[PDB]
C-alpha cells in the first residue's frame, strides 16, 4: 500500500498532472511528487500519474515507494514500458533478480518492436535482449540499451553494461537519468572518478536530482573525499525533506572525518545542526 502525503495542498489543483510535469521539467522533485499524488487523487485510475510518480520517487532516492507506485501503474496499465524499465532498475537496486528479470521479460513482451523477436533464467533474458539489439543494426534503442546494460550489471559484466549506457546516451546525450545509470555503473564497477564525472553531468542537467547526489556521495567516499561526500549527503537531505540510507552514508563519511560532535548530530539525524557545519548551504 502507498503512503500518501496527508493534506495535499495541491489536491484540488486543476491541472495537477500537467503541472507536475512542468515542475518536474524545472527540477523540483518534491513538488513534482505532490502534484503527481494530487493527480492520482483526482483520477485514481490514471496510470501515467502513477508511472511518473514512481519514477520521480526513484529519482527522489526513495526506492521503497518507487516500487509500490510502479507496480500500481503496471497493475492499471500492464503494458506501460517506462514503468517496466524503471521497475526493473529498482528491483535491481534492491537486489531482486527474479523480479527484475520478470519485468524485463514482460517489457519485451509488451514491446511492439520486440513482440516478434544459477542463473540461466537471467541469462536467458539477457540473450533475449542481446538478439533483438542485434536485429537493430544501425540505429540503437536507448531503452533497449538500458535494459541491456541493466542485464549486464545484474549479470556482473560492467564493461558491457557501461557500453550499453554510453550507447543509450549517444541517442539521448541529455538524459540525466542515464548519466546517472552510467555513473552508478562505473562506481559500482569500482571506477569512481569516471562515475563522478557522470554524476556531475546528471546534476548539471537536473540539479534537483536526489539519487545522483547520493550516488555521488558514495563515490566521494570511494575516493576518500569526505568533506565533499558529506556536503553531497547534506545537500541531498536538504532537498529531500523539501530515506534513511542517505542518513547512513552520511553517518559513515562523517565517522571518517572523525568529527564527533557532528557525528553525534548525524547519529540522531539532526539535520539543521549540519547546515553549518562550516558555513554550509
Amino acid at each position: 500500500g502507498y503512503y500518501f502525503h496527508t493534506e495535499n495542498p495541491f489536491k484540488d489543483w486543476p491541472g495537477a498532472f500537467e503541472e507536475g510535469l512542468k515542475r518536474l521539467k524545472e527540477g523540483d522533485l518534491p513538488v513534482t511528487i505532490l502534484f503527481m499524488e494530487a493527480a492520482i487523487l483526482q483520477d485514481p485510475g490514471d496510470a501515467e500519474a502513477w508511472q511518473f510518480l514512481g519514477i520521480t520517487q526513484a529519482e527522489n532516492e526513495n526506492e521503497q515507494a518507487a516500487i509500490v507506485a510502479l507496480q500500481r501503474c503496471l497493475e492499471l496499465q500492464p503494458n506501460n514500458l517506462k514503468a517496466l524499465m524503471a521497475l526493473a532498475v529498482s528491483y535491481t537496486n534492491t537486489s531482486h533478480q527474479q523480479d527484475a528479470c520478470e519485468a524485463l521479460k514482460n517489457w519485451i513482451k509488451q514491446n511492439p518492436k520486440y513482440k516478434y523477436l544459477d542463473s540461466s533464467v537471467l541469462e536467458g533474458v539477457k540473450e533475449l535482449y542481446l538478439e533483438a539489439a542485434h536485429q537493430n543494426g544501425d540505429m540503437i534503442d536507448p531503452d533497449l540499451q538500458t535494459g541491456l546494460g541493466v542485464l549486464f550489471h545484474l549479470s556482473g559484466e560492467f564493461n558491457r553494461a557501461i557500453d550499453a549506457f554510453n550507447a543509450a546516451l549517444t541517442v539521448r546525450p541529455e538524459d540525466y537519468s542515464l548519466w546517472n545509470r552510467l555513473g552508478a555503473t562505473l562506481a559500482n564497477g569500482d571506477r569512481s572518478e569516471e562515475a563522478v564525472e557522470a554524476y556531475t553531468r546528471a546534476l548539471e542537467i537536473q540539479p534537483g536530482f536526489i539519487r545522483s547526489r547520493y550516488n555521488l556521495g558514495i563515490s566521494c567516499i570511494n575516493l576518500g573525499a569526505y568533506r565533499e561526500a558529506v556536503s553531497n549527503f547534506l545537500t541531498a537531505l536538504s532537498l529531500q525533506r523539501k530515506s534513511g540510507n542517505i542518513w547512513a552514508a552520511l553517518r559513515i563519511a562523517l565517522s571518517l572525518m572523525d568529527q564527533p560532535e557532528l557525528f553525534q548530530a548525524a547519529n540522531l539525524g539532526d539535520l539543521d545542526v549540519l547546515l553549518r557545519a562550516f558555513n554550509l548551504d
Binding site: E61, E63, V89, T92, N93, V150, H153, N180, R181, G183, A184, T185, A187, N188, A195, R211, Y214, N215, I218, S219, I221, N222, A249
Partner: peptide, 6 residues
C-alpha cells in the same frame, strides 16, 4: 563496501 543506485 557500498553500492550505487541506478
Amino acid at each position: 563496501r557500498l553500492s550505487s543506485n541506478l
